[PDB]
Design a protein around this ligand. Structure first.
Ligand SMILES: *SCC1=CC(C)(C)N(O)C1(C)C
Length: 56
């Protein structure tokens, strides 16, 4: 499935996507994406829109 990440950081704001078999796996990918891009924040996930947010 295609999942979306919305980053709401102090400096980084944007959207990206990944393909994963379940939300747990997507979450791993996006937590790494956020960290790799210097973001350390508060997470939310709506399976009804396959969308994660990370907000600082
Ligand atoms: S908890 C904040 C949040 C993120 C997102 C998945 C986009 N949502 O629908 C709400 C607004 C609940």
């Amino acid at each position: 499935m295609q999942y979306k990440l919305i980053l709401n950081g102090k400096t980084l704001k944007g959207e990206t996507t990944t393909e994963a078999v379940d939300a747990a796996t997507a979450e791993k990918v996006f937590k790494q994406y956020a960290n790799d891009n210097g973001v350390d924040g508060e997470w939310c996930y709506d399976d009804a829109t396959k969308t994660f947010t990370v907000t600082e």
